[PDB]
């Protein structure tokens with residue numbers, strides 16, 4: 001919009017020259033530096049350096065704002081595509097921030113395969129179905145494989161090294177560690193706003209192991225709900241999409257059936273704001289895609 005150095009009110013060419021000559025080629029250069037560093041580096045009157053510095057900060061939107069108009073600025077709906085039209089549609093557009101979305105099914109139904117894909121797909125620009133955001137992969141079992149990622153990255157013509165740089169990975173070794181990790185997400189995501197996706201494949205893993213009996217069922221429920229509340233609150237309070245998987249106060253629950261060959265049926269089970277349907281997608285070298293026929 002009011003983007004370049006020229007666009008700011010009645011600035012002289014005489015001036016604009018001295019700015020480029022002083023290495024303040026952009027609005028950002030100005031908006032960071034002080035009028036004192038500017039008024040010597042540019043070689044201009046101090047007052048003038050200050051005028052400009054504010055007219056930049058004002059040209060970019062660096063001002064006071066009511067907390068309401070910051071809400072209205074960023075409360076908008078944000079969704080990440082799965083790679084499958086069909087599946088995005090079932091999801092009414094895709095994976096949504098401030099929502100925990102669960103995918104459960106038997107091994108190789110594509111619950112873990114989605115996670116990988118989405119940890120790439122967040123990094124895409126919005127026009128391409130992403131949020132230009134990072135992702136956190138929490139792994140209970142060692143299911144995570146960077147090579148699955150690398151493949152999905154190649155498949156979009158993306159920079160492989162970079163894609164992998166935008167995914168933080170940890171392995172939950174233990175139910176207790178798994179809670180520490182989610183507990184410490186709050187700091188990490190405040191330290192790094194660009195994180196728009198947390199996945200936890202696959203949550204119950206460690207709870208079933210450590211609390212196996214049907215007397216441990218309640219003993220492990222109280223433990224598992226506490227843990228999902230945490231996740232749910234991260235999503236809401238930090239505007240992040242949370243995905244959990246599962247083998248066989250929460251959110252959306254989608255089951256995943258194996259169908260003919262590479263193709264999978266995702267049916268929705270619990271999501272009262274979503275239509276009751278099921279749809280078919282496919283698992284490919286490239287990652288999640290739509291099916292043939």
Ligand SMILES: [Cl-]
Pocket residue numbers: 107108109110111112113
């Ligand atoms: Cl899977």
